[PDB]
Design a protein around this ligand. Structure first.
Ligand SMILES: Cc1cc2nc3c(=O)[nH]c(=O)nc-3n(C[C@H](O)[C@H](O)[C@H](O)COP(=O)(O)O)c2cc1C
Length: 169
């Protein structure tokens, strides 16, 4: 497929979101779903457009599978690639570290010459601090199944619609 979606998940929520994103884009013919747990960093080279999904765990840390491949990101040719991000988090329980993992990945990947695409507004959330916030916006789609599960479907629908422009669709 033209778009490669790489996600990591601990309790399965992020995988469910990844599947919904794939569906909104039009299915398997448009977006490839790849669990980062089973991927080599080089797998990310095969796509010109990437979607990176990662939930935040351990109080402001990356999900373990993303943590494992983090050091190899440096060897990937990210130059000129457009990359979008999404993450699952809990704004009530972790108000000071909401969506930090998504922020950690974007900071690293954007520093390797890629172009971040898919900024999202922070106004629909209530949190104190987040490493995923840049200039009053999230670097990607923030999903909260723990406190706002009823907003998930429309958030994905809206975000994908916005992404289609950026990915030449
Ligand atoms: C022990 C624990 C730590 C967590 N830490 C964070 C955190 O630091 N920041 C955040 O935004 N959410 C945090 N969460 C919420 C999870 O990211 C959230 O439940 C998410 O849906 C899990 O996604 P997954 O099923 O794809 O692994 C944590 C949840 C638990 C139970």
């Amino acid at each position: 497929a033209k778009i490669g979606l790489f996600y990591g998940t601990q309790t399965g929520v992020t995988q469910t979101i990844a599947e919904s994103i794939q569906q909104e884009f039009g299915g398997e013919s448009i977006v490839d779903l790849n669990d980062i747990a089973n991927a080599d960093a080089s797998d990310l080279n095969a796509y010109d457009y990437l979607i990176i999904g990662c939930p935040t765990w351990g109080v402001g840390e990356l999900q373990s599978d993303w943590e494992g491949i983090y050091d190899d990101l440096d060897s990937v040719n990210f130059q000129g690639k457009k990359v979008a991000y999404f993450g699952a988090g809990d704004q009530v329980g972790y108000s000071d570290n909401f969506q930090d993992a998504m922020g950690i990945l974007e900071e690293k990947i954007s520093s390797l010459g890629s172009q971040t695409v898919g900024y999202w507004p922070i106004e629909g959330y209530d949190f104190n601090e987040s490493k995923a916030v840049r200039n009053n916006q999230f670097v990607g789609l923030a999903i909260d199944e723990d406190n706002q599960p009823d907003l998930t479907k429309n958030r994905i629908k809206t975000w994908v619609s916005q992404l289609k422009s950026e990915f030449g669709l």
